[PDB]
């Protein structure tokens, strides 16, 4: 794995410890502080050392002068400190530094060194965030949690959780215009942020219904801003009329990003016959490219109504999937992981091992070990974190209705 630096402050004394998560090197560390001007330097040569600050401080931020991945830990004292910072004055650190913190906190939950309540507490400056970088890294952390909840009997906490995400990003969703305007970062943020809102049935779905209905009523002759099409197709594909129509454009569409967008829309339908239809003609290979099947199987497997037909399909048709798509192929590795790597129970983990060792010669793929390891990890994580997250969600809802701080 990677370097893990632990930072402990005791007045003016900064303790620095290095270790390798999963013996020793000269670690080029930098840092700023609540009193600090510039970026200060320290070469940790040893397991641990201490440096002296000229005065006491309210928060400290470290970076390691290396390429690639590393986590910086601090601890209960230090994470609280940075949290209050991010919530008071979040641009006191850079766009990437805020993304580092977010990524680190949540990995440290998975590693067992910070609680899930403390990360979920940190993620609340997010209602004050603007920049794309922490917003996506934010999503990269949180969305996986509900993907695990969707495959389980956890509907009430699933909904309170997504309700919490959308509440995080509500002001930044409301700010977007339904145009193609701005820089590459602002176009990508608009696109993914409007699609997220529609995915989560943020009521003000309607806007996308309107644009969709207009677009359809014109037989596709009106132009839609390109930044907004994914949303529009996605909520437009929730009806059968809109699904059938959007599919008609697919056949006659000689545009490749257009066909991709439409592919996504149709795969997110809660109509299961259509999911079964998509998987069938995709696999037949004549109404849809067989090249597309690896994607379509996986998009459906993440579909909260679609996941049991993907996995089932993968299993009934395994011998023909290997003929078309070979065994060693990345295609088959993609389809395995995408249909099973989001399970988080004992029954589910044995279901996989069951199915894949029953293959014999045809069993020895390491994607089966990865998707076991990841399922083992999910099981551990859920077993540990679901009751915590559930109490945190219910609790955080309640302090907005009334906390002792909120006057009295």
UniProtKB/Swiss-Prot annotation:
Induction: By IFNG/IFN-gamma. N-glycosylated. Glycans are attached at residues 221, 362. It is found in: Endoplasmic reticulum membrane. Coiled coil: none annotated. Ubiquitous. It comes from the Eukaryota. Aminopeptidase that plays a central role in peptide trimming, a step required for the generation of most HLA class I-binding peptides. Peptide trimming is essential to customize longer precursor peptides to fit them to the correct length required for presentation on MHC class I molecules. Strongly prefers substrates 9-16 residues long. Rapidly degrades 13-mer to a 9-mer and then stops. Preferentially hydrolyzes the residue Leu and peptides with a hydrophobic C-terminus, while it has weak activity toward peptides with charged C-terminus. May play a role in the inactivation of peptide hormones. Monomer. May also exist as a heterodimer; with ERAP2. Interacts with RBMX. Belongs to the peptidase M1 family. This is Endoplasmic reticulum aminopeptidase 1. The gene is ERAP1. The chain holds residues 529 to 941 of 941 of the full protein.
């Amino acid at each position: 794995g990677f370097p893990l630096i632990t930072i402990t402050v005791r007045g003016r004394n900064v303790h620095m410890k290095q270790e390798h998560y999963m013996y020793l090197w000269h670690v080029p560390l930098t840092f700023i502080t609540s009193k600090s001007d510039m970026v200060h330097r320290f070469l940790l040569k040893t397991k641990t050392d201490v440096l002296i600050l000229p005065e006491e401080v309210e928060w400290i931020k470290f970076n390691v002068g290396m390429n690639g991945y590393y986590i910086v830990h601090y601890e209960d004292d230090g994470w609280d400190s940075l949290t209050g910072l991010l919530k008071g004055t979040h641009t006191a650190v850079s766009s990437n530094d805020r993304a580092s913190l977010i990524n680190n906190a949540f990995q440290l939950v998975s590693i067992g060194k910070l609680s899930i309540e403390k990360a979920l507490d940190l993620s609340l400056y997010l209602k004050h965030e603007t920049e794309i970088m922490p917003v996506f890294q934010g999503l990269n952390e949180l969305i996986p949690m509900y993907k695990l909840m969707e495959k389980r009997d956890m509907n009430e906490v699933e909904t309170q959780f997504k309700a919490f995400l959308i509440r995080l990003l509500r002001d930044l969703i409301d700010k977007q215009t339904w145009t193609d305007e701005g820089s590459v970062s602002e176009r990508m943020l608009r696109s993914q942020l409007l699609l997220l809102a529609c995915v989560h049935n943020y009521q003000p779905v309607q806007r996308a219904e309107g644009y969709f209905r207009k677009w359809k009523e014109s037989n596709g002759n009106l132009s839609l801003p390109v930044d907004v099409t994914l949303a529009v197709f996605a909520v437009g594909a929730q009806s059968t009329e809109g699904w059938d129509f959007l599919y008609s454009k697919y056949q006659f569409s000689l545009s490749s990003t257009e066909k991709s967008q439409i592919e996504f829309a149709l795969c997110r339908t809660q109509n299961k016959e259509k999911l079964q239809w998509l998987l069938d003609e995709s696999f037949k290979g004549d109404k849809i490219k067989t090249q597309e099947f690896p994607q379509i199987l996986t998009l459906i497997g993440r579909n909260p109504v679609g996941y049991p037909l993907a996995w089932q399909f993968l299993r009934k048709n395994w011998n023909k999937l290997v003929q078309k798509f070979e065994l060693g192929s990345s295609s088959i590795a993609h389809m395995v992981m995408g249909t099973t790597n989001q399970f988080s129970t004992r029954t589910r983990l044995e279901e996989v091992k069951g199915f894949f060792s029953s293959l014999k010669e045809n069993s020895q793929l390491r994607c089966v070990q990865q998707t076991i390891e990841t399922i083992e990890e999910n099981i551990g994580w859920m077993d540990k974190n679901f009751d915590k997250i559930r109490v945190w969600l219910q609790s955080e809802k309640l302090e907005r209705m009334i906390i002792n701080f909120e006057k009295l």
